[PDB]
Amino acid sequence: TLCGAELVDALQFVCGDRGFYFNTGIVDECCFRSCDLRRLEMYC
Amino acid sequence: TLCGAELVDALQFVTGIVDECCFRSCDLRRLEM
Amino acid sequence: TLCGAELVDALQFVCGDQTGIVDECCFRSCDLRRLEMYCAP
Amino acid sequence: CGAELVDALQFVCGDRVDECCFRSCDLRRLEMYCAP
Amino acid sequence: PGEVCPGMDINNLTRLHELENCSVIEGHLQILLMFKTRPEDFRDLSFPKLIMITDYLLLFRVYGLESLKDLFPNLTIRGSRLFFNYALVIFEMVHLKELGLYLMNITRGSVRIEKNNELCYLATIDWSRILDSVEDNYIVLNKDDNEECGDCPGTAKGKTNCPATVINGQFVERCWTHSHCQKVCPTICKSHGCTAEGLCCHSECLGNCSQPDDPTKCVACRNFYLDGRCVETCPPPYYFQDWRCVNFSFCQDLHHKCKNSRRQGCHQYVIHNNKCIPECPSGYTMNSSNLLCTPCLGPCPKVCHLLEGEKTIDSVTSAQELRGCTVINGSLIINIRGGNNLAAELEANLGLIEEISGYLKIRRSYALVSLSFFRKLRLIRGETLEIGNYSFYALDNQNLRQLWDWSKHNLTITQGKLFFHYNPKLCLSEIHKMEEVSGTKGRQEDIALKTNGDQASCENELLKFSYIRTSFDKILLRWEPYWPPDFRDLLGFMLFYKEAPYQNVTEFDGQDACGSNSWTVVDIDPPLRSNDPKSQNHPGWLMRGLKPWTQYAIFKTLVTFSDERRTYGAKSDIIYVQTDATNPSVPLDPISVSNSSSQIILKWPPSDPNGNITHYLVFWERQAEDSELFELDYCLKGLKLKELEESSFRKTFEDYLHNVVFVPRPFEKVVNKESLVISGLRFTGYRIELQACNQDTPEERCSVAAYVSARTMPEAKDDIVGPVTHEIFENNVVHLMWQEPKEPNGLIVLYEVSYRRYGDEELHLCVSRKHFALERGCRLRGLSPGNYSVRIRATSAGNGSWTEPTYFYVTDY
Amino acid sequence: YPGEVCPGMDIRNNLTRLHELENCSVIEGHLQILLMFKTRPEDFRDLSFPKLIMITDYLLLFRVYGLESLKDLFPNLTVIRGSRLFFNYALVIFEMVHLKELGLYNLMNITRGSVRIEKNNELCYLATDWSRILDSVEDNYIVLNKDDNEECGDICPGTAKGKTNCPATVINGQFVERCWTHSHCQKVCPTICKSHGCTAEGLCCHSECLGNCSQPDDPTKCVACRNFYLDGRCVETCPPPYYHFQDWRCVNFSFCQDLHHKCKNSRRQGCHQYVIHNNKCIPECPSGYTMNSSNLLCTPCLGPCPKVCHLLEGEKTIDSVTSAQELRGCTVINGSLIINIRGGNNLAAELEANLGLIEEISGYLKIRRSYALVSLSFFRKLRLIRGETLEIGNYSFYALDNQNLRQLWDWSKHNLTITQGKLFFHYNPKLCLSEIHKMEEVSGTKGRQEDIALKTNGDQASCENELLKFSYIRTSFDKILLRWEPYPPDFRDLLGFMLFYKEAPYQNVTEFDGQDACGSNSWTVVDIDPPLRSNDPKSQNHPGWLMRGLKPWTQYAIFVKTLVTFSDERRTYGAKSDIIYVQTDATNPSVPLDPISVSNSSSQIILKWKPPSDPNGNTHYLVFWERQAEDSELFELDYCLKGLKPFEKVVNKESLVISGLRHFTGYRIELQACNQDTPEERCSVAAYVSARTMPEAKADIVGPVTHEIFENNVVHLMWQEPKEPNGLIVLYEVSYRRYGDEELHLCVSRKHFALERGCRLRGLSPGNYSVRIRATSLAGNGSWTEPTYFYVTDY
């Protein structure tokens, strides 16, 4: 049930390949309901 | 209000007056009873 | 000065309808508290 | 306070100041301040 | 005796006199302002024919009251009906000059005399005899101090032609007019009158009788309605006054007419007491079947009277009439917007209430946080539903938290319904419990579910405890960790700690919207969250300044509310802890009876026990008496929301940022008594050192030592007796001898030798140690020629020993 | 500008990408440096950008695991315009793990928005002048910066260098120095100068200038153009065939046309087909006007034409001006609006600027949790709430919770229309009952058959209107003597008159202050039953409370708000006048305090004085003292026994610096407290104090002492007393000794000296003798005289 500062380091601990993509989101999908590796890693 | 010295002097001139004339409809006729 | 109708209306407001207000509040130090004692107890 | 803080930290710790005094320190701080 | 006149009111003048023919009145008679007429007749008209008035008499600026000399004396009030519990009132007279009505007894009612514009002669009348009237004590000299009288057959006119009785410690003569006074009777002949010559009337009489021992001439009645040669000498079987009985049927009828009287006035009377009374002892009730008073199951069985059927309560003082009640006939409406206290005031009044019949509503209030101040309520009948066919109605109580501790209370309602509207601080679990306890859940089956409590925490979790350590003045505390889903919303912890002399406390028991602050509240900021939740530090805190021996009570987090989910950090079990024992404080101030060396006992158990007080210790470091004067050449006689919104805003910005920046693809010892005895010591203020400890062990904890110093009497006494052996030298020199059992402890009170010539004055000289030790004797001063007598005395007062003077003659030059 | 212009950047995950900005002077957008895990202070050794001068929209930096200071990243970032903010913030420095010094020592202005720096464990330089940069400082939000823990030395080059070297700024009177990093400090322009900026010397520059000035008053040598920039100088418009563009620069027709063609066919979304309208290159022409494909100009209104907005998914959660900005010009909305503004910081300005053109919500307008919403009047052109889709239970309007919503609308001149959807209201503590009722009658779907709650709306607000203004104000310095005018259809509708009174040191007192929710309050609540309602309105009594016990020199608040008893369902509109901050007339002050006087010298006396605890007004300029020099008894007293014995026109406080006194003076010093002395002599009781000029001594025996030789072992001595012996001489000590022998002492008092004219020596043995004489005064002992040798007769 990571929410906030934990979600920051959670993505750092997961992957370095695409380093987050860029050009309802992660907080809605992961914070309130404790997402898993499936979608959390997708934000790489 | 007139329930104080006014009522007592009116009576002296003419279920007490508190609940028959002070806080209820009354006239000079009702004072004597 | 306030010794005229002003004192009588102040008394008739604080309490409604020889040591009177003339020599106790009109020409002497007084307050609201002192007004009532001249009125009926 | 400050020095009775030291006494209290001797209790808290187990077997191991002008700051605590001034700002009414918490046990969550004296728990790692005591440990040397 | 004679005609009977019904009591009727007096807008007329000719009705001022009503004693012409009817010697008794069947009702109530009183005189009022009446026609404004001169007292031409009343000032001199005499009509003492009437003797008795059944009910009270009232006066209201009656014009006739100007001068009274012999209007109508010999008036003993029956008091069947009373006004303000008075059978006679003397009030509202603006032109009265002389009071000379001249009164034997007023029955069942006091007399009112204070605040009279015109009154006199009050100081010359003994009102105690007519009635004690201690209930009101309004019988005071209104204007006798300014001598309103103008008409006294006592010491004022010289010869005392009137009876006298003690008045406020003064033997004031009974003066009413220039010569009139009160009738006198022998003390044995009371409450039934007597003739002029002092002859006592019959025991059936009421007032003075024209014919002695003739109840026919009296106007008294009989409790059994004999209606003739009635008898009223009450035997023990006859249960009113000394001469007036009630037996067993008069007092029965006293309550029979009032049996269905659900009003004031007519009241029920009990025959169980020797005198028929309408009241009963605090633990005694009127029997439903029997007619004698029956003890209750509990004290104060009083049922509170109802007015109009509704007795609403607000601002505490409206409930003052409900100090003690058992069952309430009518309906109750409760609405307390605010006040000072909840339990100390509202539970102090409505706590004792036991049962209700019909309706009770919590209309609109704020001060009520815990409803459990209704401490003893058991059953509300609910047979009369006021509105909506309801029985108990809770409404508009924004901060009402607890109805009753349902593990303890057993309140049940036979009939009616419930309703809870606008009750935001009371979780639905509590109302469900109340319905289960009330017995109307299911049986005799209106819940808002939104206006009821939903802004406060419910569906609570459990917070377990952990490590615990304490000292005598500082208890620590550490508990298990717990986080809601979105950990940052949890603002922190609220720890509530409070004293607990006994192991029975709850949360809201001593609280209200007034902020009684029974439970001291502290807040702890959350610890830093750490990965591997096992490695997280246990959320901890300690508080200081406690008491070293009390059984303390301790236990809830803070959560910023989210609309999506209602989750709150719960409370913890009320865990009772006691700080470890330590040293007690200074002992109670000691009391020593240092009578004798063998008779010294000490008397004290101070506050701050800091453990079971078990060990007492005593010491004494001193010396009995000085001994320097014993051996040296010394003379004994010669010795000298805003923050919540801030947190929510910070969380909102964080979630916006993360949402937009992420995209997918030695000594003595006693035990329990004060002290058995202290002895062994040898006539001095022996300093005794007393120490109070905690318990009897080498690990005892002892306070500062109190100190005791008190003087014993000397167990040793007379010390020198026998004849005064002496030798006479040729140069007028004499010698003295004695034996000294020198015991160096104590002081001889006198320690001197007295010598006197024959027929001359007596002189004494001090005794020195060197006289017995060094000089081996003593020598007197210059002795004049003649017979001389010598006295030897040394006592540590003495019974008196005849020391033989053995008179001797010295050389005469 | 010396460098080109570059669009918004989103550099992340690696430093090598940052080189895309090496050649930019102004960025027409936003700069974002998001996530840099591998960085350490070494890793940023060769990175800098002094060429960047201006950023229009904003700049935000997120986790950079090694960067520590911005003094080296871009020094010359002069101005941030804030055309497109980031959640009301034009500068966001968030989760900067190692950021030691904030940098930005050459930032001048931020025209729009606020700044938020938060959650950084190494930045403690921010306590150095936001009023200089930002017009709005309340909406600023700086917290959790490792400086809130007070553990920083605030090392400042203008402060840590020693003596103060850099500008200081007054904040609540603190007036503390301000500075960025430990290398630079403020460059605050002169107060006379304004946002135009100042040069190094500190003088005003050209009006169109902004922040910094390469040359004074030169449009061609300005660092930031305050209004527009066309070819090298700053101008207030675009006179030739230039047109305003992005509100910072002018471009010709060719540029606008090329930009239009650049996405007339290109896939690039977000790009607009720029039109020339009101001599502006606006991305899309506003309501009414619409562009013709002829020459990229905007036609006049082609009949009534609305502007669809089509909010995505039919719902927009307006919570931030960066989201309200997306609705600028959308007259008719094809979705639903959910205002959710939180955390104070009223946005009525920006909300009115953007949403003030909206007219027709196609969905349900709902206002939930909006904490700062004081009114809904910013919807100044709301006509129809179409309510095509309702919320849950067929609700169009919806107010779940708004802790300050009062005005709603103004039905004096505002018409409203609801197609359907009932009305919902809950937990609005200040939603006026009359206002919501007016909403009910005014198109509140009163017909069409058609969820208000009863006491959860406006349960902490008043609904009283009758301004029974006080007839007149007559105020004693110690009591109220005024009254309020009278005025319901029936006296039974008049429960009574009660009054709120309390001391008002300031004039910020409001109705909500000291109310029922406040619990403990200073309001003096006294109820007065209205007097007889005579048939002659001229005979109106005008009830009044006239309470006594006033402080003569404090402002007071009077506010009636007469109570009333009525049905909770229907009630009269109550009566309440306006609160009056009535002051009080100053009177004679109270007893003066702290009278203490210490003699500055024998001839000088000074005193320190303090006003009473609460003086009855604003002042005294004269202090008395006792008329005394010294007791004449001390002139004659003998101490030779062995082992036996006006006013000054000065302020009371500290102005008594009187001098020229006698050396030995001690007496009473008197002073009183006064509020006025020249217009009306009102003075308090005079105080009493004494100052001792004793601790001073100046003038011993003056003049040599000769001798007189007498045969009978008698030697006489004489001297002259000093003229000013610091007061009076109390005695004289004389010692005589024969040569080669012991010494003997003697004492002469002033009384003895009056007749002896000196000292007399007796019992002197034959031979050669000597003598010494010393003077003793109350102030102190003098000095012994020179020895005098004489021959005693020898037998």
Side-chain angles (χ1 to χ4, degrees), chain E residues 39-51:
Chain E
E40 191 73 22
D41 44 349
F42 203 72
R43 79 199 303 110
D44 205 52
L45 198 52
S46 184
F47 275 126
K49 302 183 188 185
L50 175 130
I51 321 167

Side-chain angles (χ1 to χ4, degrees), chain F residues 300-315:
Chain F
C301 49
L302 316 96
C305 58
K307 323 281 119 169
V308 70
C309 207
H310 181 51
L311 270 309
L312 259 300
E313 276 47 51
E315 175 173 301

Side-chain angles (χ1 to χ4, degrees), chain A residues 1 3-4 6 21 25-26 31-32, chain E residues 485 487 529 565 658-659 663-664:
Chain A
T1 167
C3 270
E6 270 89 315
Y21 183 85
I26 183 58
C31 168
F32 98 87
Chain E
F487 81 93
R529 180 143 175 183
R565 299 180 308 252
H658 278 139
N659 227 16
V663 307

Side-chain angles (χ1 to χ4, degrees), chain D residues 1 4 6 12-13 15 17-18 20 23 29 31-32 34-35:
Chain D
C1 198
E4 190 276 305
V6 164
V12 171
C13 218
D15 54 351
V17 76
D18 42 43
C20 169
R23 83 210 80 211
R29 331 173 94 154
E31 68 195 356
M32 58 43 59
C34 67

Side-chain angles (χ1 to χ4, degrees), chain F residues 355-368:
Chain F
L355 321 175
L357 211 30
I358 312 181
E359 291 214 27
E360 296 171 15
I361 287 86
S362 92
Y364 60 101
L365 154 68
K366 137 172 144 196
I367 291 92
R368 156 156 90 85

